[PDB]
Amino acid sequence: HMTLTFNIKVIEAKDLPKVDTFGKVDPYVQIQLGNEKCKTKVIKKSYNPVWNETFSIPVTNPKAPLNITVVDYDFIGSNDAFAYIHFNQQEFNVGQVVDKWYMLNSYKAGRSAGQIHLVIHLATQNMKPFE
């Protein structure tokens, strides 16, 4: 198959900042590739959340940037994104499994946003995800 898919495992994050009104942070991760968006579950009150959630996103637009954001779920207000990492799709080679910790960028400069642990595998449709 010629159609490519981004297989992304959102494993965990560490050292997230305190951003929620009623304590710590309630983090989830949103993955954006063009018009395609998906998100993890919310982990309650955790600076070192572990999600272990896997996504498979088809590449229909080869120019869309891959944008990964960490967001604080607010049960009584707007959910505020506080950190991101973004990639050109060509930063990943077809067939390569990249298992890495990334330093998160804070939207508000000068604050630490922690790190995120992702497995990213740009794959053809029959390749076993992450293998």
UniProtKB/TrEMBL annotation:
GO terms for cellular component: membrane. One of its GO terms (molecular function) is calcium ion binding. Transmembrane segments: none annotated. Signal peptide: none annotated. The chain holds residues 1 to 130 of 238 of the full protein. Keywords: Calcium, Metal-binding. This is XYPPX repeat family protein. Residues 2-102 form the C2 domain.
